[PDB]
Amino acid sequence: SPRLDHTRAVNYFSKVKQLPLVKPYLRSVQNHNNKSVNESLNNLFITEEDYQALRTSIDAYDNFDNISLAQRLEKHELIEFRRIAAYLFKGNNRWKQSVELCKKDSLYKDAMQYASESKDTELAE
Amino acid sequence: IAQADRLTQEPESIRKWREEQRKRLQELDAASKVMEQEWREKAKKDLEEWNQRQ
């Protein structure tokens, strides 16, 4: 733990096709807010289908690429991440989430709640 | 230098090389053989990962 750079590790795992063993290695760790951690960590919770962790895996540590990440999620069928990719893209910025809807993901539900916090008034019209 | 030794320079001499080039062997070959049956068991580790989780 103490006295590794982490940055020079996850790299050897990723191009190894075996990185998940480090799953728990990322447990007590991920306080380092390090990128390789969240970055593939998410990639992990994504293909693995984890949302509880993934959500909490980012409910604090905000060190990552707030973009493409939600790009692979939208391409899903299981709205779990198409629901969070919705969040992930919006993230403390409500304008994205709504201005990106259409037939699908038009939920008669959360759609009537994510507008409220907005500030661009006219968006109501 | 000098030189002039032999019966002391070759008796233990023959020991090291011989009893060392076959005490070599092993590890290396052992390495991949076992490294084989292993990493692959890993490939299934992750594979069954996929299966259940889906």
DSSP string computed for B1-54 = ------TTTTTTHHHHHHHHHSSSSTHHHHHHHHHHHHHHHHHHHHHHHHHHH-
Identify which of B39, B46, B54 has the shortest CB distance to residue A20. B46
CB atoms within 10 A of CB A104: 8
What is the distance between the alpha carbons of residues A104 and A101, in angstroms, rounded to a whole number? Answer: 7
B37 CA: distance to closest CA in chain A (Å):
15
Q: What is the dihedral of CA A3, A24, A46, A86, to 10 degrees?
A: -70
Give the number of residues written for chain A: 125
For residue B23, the distance in angstroms to the closest alpha carbon of chain A comes to 32
**Cβ atoms of residues A20 and A49 within 8 Å:** no
Report how far residue A70's alpha carbon sits from residue A122's, in angstroms, rounded to the nearest whole number: 27
- Among B42, B46, B53, the residue with its CB nearest the CB of A49 is B53
CA A77/CA A82 separation, integer angstroms: 8
Contacts A49 to B, Cβ<8 Å: 53-54
> Which one, of B35, B54, B45, B36, lies nearest residue A20 by Cα?
B45
Among the listed residues A102, A40, A97, the one whose alpha carbon sits nearest the alpha carbon of residue A72: A40
Q: How far apart are CA A74 and CA B51, in angstroms?
A: 22
Contacts of A69 (CB under 8 A, 6+ apart): A42, A85, A88
What is d(CA A5, CA A106) in angstroms, rounded to the nearest whole number?
A: 44
Q: Which residue has the tokens 């069928």?
A: A77
AA identity, residue A19: L
Report which residue type is found at A31: N
How many Cβ atoms sit within 10 Å of the Cβ of residue A81? Answer: 25
Please answer whether residues A29 and A51 qualify as being in contact, where contact means their C-beta atoms are separated by less than 8 angstroms. Answer: no
- Way the structure was solved: X-ray
